[PDB]
Ligand binder design. Structure first.
Ligand SMILES: Cc1c(C#N)cccc1-c1cc(-c2ccn(Cc3cccc(C(C)(C)O)n3)c(=O)c2)nc(N)n1
Ligand SMILES: CC(C)CCC[C@@H](C)[C@H]1CC[C@H]2[C@@H]3CC=C4C[C@@H](O)CC[C@]4(C)[C@H]3CC[C@]12C
Ligand SMILES: CCCCCCCC/C=C/CCCCCCCC(=O)OC[C@H](O)CO
Ligand SMILES: CCCCCCCC/C=C/CCCCCCCC(=O)O
Ligand SMILES: CCCCCCCC/C=C/CCCCCCCC(=O)O
Ligand SMILES: CCCCCCCC/C=C\CCCCCCCC(=O)O
Ligand SMILES: CCCCCCCC/C=C\CCCCCCCC(=O)O
Ligand SMILES: CCCCCCCC/C=C\CCCCCCCC(=O)O
Ligand SMILES: CCCCCCCC/C=C\CCCCCCCC(=O)O
Ligand SMILES: CCCCCCCC/C=C\CCCCCCCC(=O)O
Ligand SMILES: CCCCCCCC/C=C\CCCCCCCC(=O)O
Ligand SMILES: CCCCCCCC/C=C\CCCCCCCC(=O)O
Ligand SMILES: CCCCCCCC/C=C\CCCCCCCC(=O)O
Ligand SMILES: CCCCCCCC/C=C\CCCCCCCC(=O)O
Ligand SMILES: CCCCCCCC/C=C\CCCCCCCC(=O)O
Ligand SMILES: CCCCCCCC/C=C\CCCCCCCC(=O)O
Ligand SMILES: CCCCCCCC/C=C\CCCCCCCC(=O)O
Ligand SMILES: CCCCCCCC/C=C\CCCCCCCC(=O)O
Ligand SMILES: CCCCCCCC/C=C\CCCCCCCC(=O)O
Ligand SMILES: CCCCCCCC/C=C\CCCCCCCC(=O)O
Ligand SMILES: CCCCCCCC/C=C\CCCCCCCC(=O)O
Ligand code: NA
Length: 448
């Protein structure tokens, strides 16, 4: 058996798995409306690039491994096409990382800013940039515009013979790969730290009532800032800014920092606590509650007012009697629960447990998808970095012994393997994908 026959068989197997797996990804998104969100628009664009790796890039790699004689511009397309697909993968991975960041940082205003029309525009632009970046050697930055044994007008189609190494290192690796990879590392780190933020009264009502650092209108149309801090009933934003500047201590033009919103919210808590202590019905309960259960009581006061909370005579006395589970059942049978069940369920869970578990869980639900997508970037890095580092050695140590043939084969094949792994990750970590996969395979493929 020839070593070439092993290499070709391995490449063709990777090609088939790349096409089949990533066709299944696009097929699932097209079939399942629950997978038709903006995040999976970039998943499909990423899946399309990996299909093209199996149909074209891998066959292109097998042909240029022979170093055949070809015209320079035709040889450069065969060699540089995989650079287009790899660059498109980077832009899609970059878009997925950014999309998940604003999803957890502005969870309320995510849909208004992140839309399907904008995602489709970014995808079309990124595919154009990928061709411009990948096929840059075709536009003049190549080493065949100036191989003995090929005849003039042709060159031996060898990648390192035709693709300049300073392009591969400075422009492609450092600027077009390393920088987006490090930015993706910082974005996902920022996502993971936000999910691990310490919970307190400020973060509890940030989840329940939102945080806005810019002045906005509420459900009535009253100007508001921070965590539900009313500024004025006047129909003038300038009147609201005047109230904001007085409370903050500086000219704001309607924008504040997170610490300024937290300080403004700390004063609102002190006012609500002073009102609770003045109420003869609420003070004995508040005095008996622990710090976290007091935050749930302040939560209700911020939503319904001191008088509204005082109307929970039965639930309040069971809270003061430390009968947590009984108070939960009673509070769930109230109008406040029926009107806003999600916020009420989180507040009632706080009363039962005395922990922030209901608000931590809200944070983890927003980031579990991010951990699976972050694994894909790591596998992309692990699969492509060996080639980039080899290119850096050849570039910066010219008299160094070139990497042996077996490592070159392994690094090239490993890079192609990256076009197979993503559908396996979705299947193992994302249930909506795994379930759609099973339906497609059992129904459309296996017919039963
Ligand atoms: C394309 C790329 C990207 C991207 N996107 C990122 C980093 C590096 C590279 C990259 C690729 C190649 C390179 C060379 C040759 N072949 C054909 C081939 C197949 C099997 C065996 C051989 C042997 C060993 C016989 O040469 N050749 C390739 O497929 C790929 N070379 C270099 N320096 N960098
Ligand atoms: C955040 C970190 C990882 C970025 C650092 C960039 C890395 C990938 C780059 C920057 C400097 C580079 C090194 C510069 C000089 C040398 C010595 C030479 O004889 C072999 C290549 C080698 C060893 C290079 C390998 C790749 C290298 C380490
Ligand atoms: C996700 C990471 C794990 C999955 C990916 C693991 C690495 C890729 C699999 C490789 C075997 C291919 C290595 C051998 C390369 C071709 C065979 C060969 O070298 O034969 C040619 C011979 O040297 C002269 O003709
Ligand atoms: C016509 C192509 C559609 C799929 C063909 C049938 C399966 C081919 C295998 C592709 C590897 C996909 C890896 C992840 C999918 C796992 C399947 C599953 O979740 O049950
Ligand atoms: C143009 C090349 C750089 C693009 C790479 C990825 C950056 C975009 C990331 C995707 C975020 C999800 C969609 C958000 C839409 C932005 C709203 C807008 O400003 O129009
Ligand atoms: C997934 C399964 C893929 C199965 C085999 C891929 C095609 C193998 C063809 C071998 C041809 C190699 C040769 O003889 O030159
Ligand atoms: C191997 C190259 C060609 C295969 C890749 C493209 C085929 C798979 C693409 C996505 C599958 C889901 C989208 C199909 C849309 C069908 C349109 C329609 O029937 O109205
Ligand atoms: C080689 C050229 C392949 C080009 C990319 C195919 C288009 C991107 C896939 C569709 C993404 C848009 C969407 O799914 O909403
Ligand atoms: C030759 C390369 C073929 C490139 C990709 C073909 C599939 C493009 C993905 C479109 C899927 C449609 C969809 O599900 O939205
Ligand atoms: C998934 C479909 C892809 C299969 C169709 C493309 C066929 C593969 C392309 C070339 C096959 C081998 C031809 C080159 C011989 C290389 C042997 C050598 O290096 O000496
Ligand atoms: C599934 C489809 C796979 C198609 C694989 C095509 C393989 C392409 C291999 C090289 C042929 C074109 C490169 C050389 C021709 C132009 C240069 C010249 O004419 O001298
Ligand atoms: C697939 C079509 C994409 C572009 C192919 C560009 C071919 C480059 C010029 C060919 C050189 C030659 O005539 O040998
Ligand atoms: C799904 C099928 C995809 C169709 C694309 C087929 C791939 C063709 C491969 C390379 C062709 C362009 C490279 C050389 C072009 C010049 C060749 C010539 O004119 O003699
Ligand atoms: C040669 C054809 C190459 C691939 C064409 C891919 C672009 C068309 C798919 C668009 C899918 C969609 O967003 O509806
Ligand atoms: C000779 C090289 C020829 C280069 C052709 C490629 C130039 C066109 C740029 C990208 C083609 C793929 C189109 C994908 C964008 C559509 C996706 C979308 O709109 O949703
Ligand atoms: C067309 C969309 C925008 C394109 C800008 C980014 C894509 C890359 C474009 C060309 C880069 C050219 C780099 C030139 C470096 C020196 C050239 C040389 O030494 O021969
Ligand atoms: C996705 C990010 C794209 C960023 C593109 C812009 C970055 C360009 C940075 C410099 C690359 C080229 C530096 C040296 C030029 C080569 C010198 C020469 O050969 O003429
Ligand atoms: C991040 C982008 C880094 C881009 C390149 C930094 C180093 C530039 C050195 C240019 C050398 C000129 C040359 O290639 O001959
Ligand atoms: C240095 C270039 C960039 C390197 C990869 C960047 C992407 C980093 C994203 C997250 C890594 C994987 C996250 C999965 C968490 C697994 C838990 C663990 O291993 O500690
Ligand atoms: C050098 C590139 C460093 C990129 C890191 C940017 C910060 C990450 C972030 O905060 O989003
Ligand atoms: C892990 C990735 C290591 C990349 C291999 C570079 C080795 C340098 C060399 O052998 O010349
Ligand atoms: Na890819």
């Amino acid at each position: 058996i020839m070593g070439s026959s092993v290499y070709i068989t391995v490449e063709l197997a990777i090609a088939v798995l790349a096409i089949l797996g990533n066709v299944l990804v696009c097929w699932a998104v097209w079939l399942n409306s629950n997978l038709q969100n903006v995040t999976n628009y970039f998943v499909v664009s990423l899946a399309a690039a990996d299909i093209a790796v199996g149909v074209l890039a891998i066959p292109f790699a097998i042909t240029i491994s022979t170093g055949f004689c070809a015209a320079c511009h035709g040889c450069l397309f065969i060699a540089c096409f995989v650079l287009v697909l790899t660059q498109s993968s980077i832009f899609s991975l970059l878009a997925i990382a950014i999309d998940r960041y604003i999803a957890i940082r502005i969870p309320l205003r995510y849909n208004g800013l992140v839309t399907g029309t904008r995602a489709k525009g970014i995808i079309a632009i990124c595919w154009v940039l990928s061709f411009a970046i990948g096929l840059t050697p075709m536009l003049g930055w190549n080493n065949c515009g100036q191989s003995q044994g090929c005849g003039e007008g042709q060159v031996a189609c060898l990648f390192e013979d035709v693709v300049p190494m300073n392009y591969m290192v400075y422009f492609n690796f450092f600027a077009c790969v390393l920088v987006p990879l490090l930015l993706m590392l910082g974005v996902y780190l920022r996502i993971f730290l936000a999910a691990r933020r310490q919970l307190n009264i400020f973060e509890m009502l940030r989840i329940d009532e939102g945080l806005r650092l810019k002045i906005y209108k509420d459900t009535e149309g009253y100007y508001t800032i921070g965590i539900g801090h009313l500024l004025t009933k006047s129909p003038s934003l300038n009147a609201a800014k005047s109230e904001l500047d007085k409370a903050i201590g500086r000219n704001t033009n309607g924008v504040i920092t997170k610490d300024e919103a937290e300080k403004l919210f700390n004063q609102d808590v002190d006012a609500a606590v002073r009102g609770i202590l003045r109420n003869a019905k609420l003070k004995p309960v508040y005095d008996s509650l622990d710090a976290v259960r007091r935050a749930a009581l302040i939560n209700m006061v911020f939503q319904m007012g001191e008088t509204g909370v005082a109307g929970f005579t039965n639930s309040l006395r069971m809270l003061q009697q430390k009968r947590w589970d009984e108070a939960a059942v009673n509070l769930a049978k109230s109008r406040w629960y029926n009107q806003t069940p999600n916020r009420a369920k989180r507040v009632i869970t706080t009363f039962r447990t005395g922990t922030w578990d209901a608000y931590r869980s809200t944070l983890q639900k927003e980031v579990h998808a991010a951990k699976s997508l972050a694994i894909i970037v790591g596998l992309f890095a692990l699969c492509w970095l060996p080639l980039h580092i080899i290119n850096c050695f050849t570039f910066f140590c010219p008299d160094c012994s070139h990497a042996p043939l077996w490592l070159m084969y392994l690094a090239i094949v490993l890079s192609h393997t990256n076009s197979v792994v993503n559908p396996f990750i979705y299947a193992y970590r994302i249930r909506e994908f795994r379930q759609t996969f099973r339906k497609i395979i059992r129904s459309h493929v296996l017919r039963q």
